[PDB]
Amino acid sequence: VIANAHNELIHDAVLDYYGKRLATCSSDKTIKIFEVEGETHKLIDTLTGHEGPVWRVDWAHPKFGTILASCSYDGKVLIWKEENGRWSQIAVHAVHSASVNSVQWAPHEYGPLLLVASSDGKVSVVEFKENGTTSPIIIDAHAIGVNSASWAPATKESRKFVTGGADNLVKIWKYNSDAQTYVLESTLEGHSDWVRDVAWSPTVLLRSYLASVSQDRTCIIWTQDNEQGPWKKTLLKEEKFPDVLWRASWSLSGNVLALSGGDNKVTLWKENLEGKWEPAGEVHDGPCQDNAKLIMKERRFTASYTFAKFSTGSMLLTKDIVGKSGVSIKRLPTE
């Protein structure tokens, strides 16, 4: 009836490719690594190096070894690697001059490719190559600041990714061989406030599925039937959600969408009739019977902030301030 919780200001978490390694990052500048087995989480190492709140973390594909990517408000991205049980920092990606808000590895087919979004208004793509053919591609995306960037599924010029800025816009970028960089292929203007997160669905059918989440308390599903055709705008539901939406995540199959924010619970959404979206599920020292405050004012984060992410093996990890790791992981059949 009355619960005493730990300092769970965890901002992000990610489950590796099998489901044996969990990583969480928080506002207290620390990254934790958990050994996942069954329904219990074993802390094994605390990674330190960031001089500010850590916003995101993302595992690389196991075919590159055990590699973790983390980004922070300190404007830096850190690449961590485990060698014979030894966790060591093996890279510093500090090209951005402002809070780095998101990081995500590309589809393995492209290689050890990292996508980065920053409040400095730019997006960087760095192919780390262990033995050293490594130059970064830097792009101006959302002058007023980029909040999130997400890769598109694999099918060089076929490489694509979506971004969401503090200018209320969603932008789609494709790689151009002749230009030697990613170019703006589309701009979408559905939202009336900060786009908190954008997610490109891995589903492989006719249309392309795209989900944008905004500070205006609405979610938009973007669709594209033919590869060069326009982009259709479709509100998830007709009316606004009670509160701010923070995150969106597509399951690796079954095309199910997981929303963080809006209602007081992580809500799932599936599409079962042409262009109709409906709820398909849901998920639910301080006693509730420092500077993180300021940085969150500028970052416009509130107390109702939460996250949720789909993972291979059909898993969904959500924020749970009561767990040992502060994260819950439920396997979820999605078809």
UniProtKB/Swiss-Prot annotation:
InterPro entries: Sec13/Seh1_fam, WD40/YVTN_repeat-like_dom_sf, WD40_repeat_dom_sf, WD40_rpt. The keyword Protein transport applies. It is found in: Cytoplasmic vesicle, COPII-coated vesicle membrane; Endoplasmic reticulum membrane; Nucleus, Nuclear pore complex; Vacuole membrane. The keyword Nucleus applies. One of its GO terms (biological process) is positive regulation of TORC1 signaling. SMART domains: WD40. GO terms for molecular function: structural molecule activity. It comes from the Eukaryota. Keywords: Cytoplasmic vesicle, Endoplasmic reticulum, ER-Golgi transport, Membrane, mRNA transport, Nuclear pore complex, Nucleus, Protein transport, Repeat, Translocation, Transport, Vacuole, WD repeat. One of its GO terms (cellular component) is Seh1-associated complex. It is a peripheral membrane protein. WD repeats lie at residues 5-44, 49-90, 95-136, 141-183, 190-232, 240-279. PANTHER family: NUCLEAR PORE COMPLEX PROTEIN SEC13 / SEH1 FAMILY MEMBER, PROTEIN SEC13 HOMOLOG. Functions as a component of the nuclear pore complex (NPC) and the COPII coat. It is one of 5 proteins constituting the COPII coat, which is involved in anterograde (ER to Golgi) double-membrane transport vesicle formation. First the small GTPase SAR1, activated by and binding to the integral ER membrane protein SEC12, exchanges GDP for GTP and recruits the heterodimer SEC23/24, which in turn recruits the heterotetramer SEC13-SEC31. The polymerization of COPII coat complexes then causes physically the deformation (budding) of the membrane, leading to the creation of a transport vesicle. Present with 21400 molecules/cell in log phase SD medium. Belongs to the WD repeat SEC13 family. The basic repeat unit of a COPII coated vesicle is composed of 5 proteins: the small GTPase SAR1, the heterodimeric SEC23-SEC24 complex, and the heterotetrameric SEC13-SEC31 complex. This repeat unit polymerizes to induce membrane deformation into a transport vesicle. Component of the nuclear pore complex (NPC). NPC constitutes the exclusive means of nucleocytoplasmic transport. This is Protein transport protein SEC13. It comes from Saccharomyces cerevisiae (strain ATCC 204508 / S288c) (Baker's yeast). The gene is SEC13.
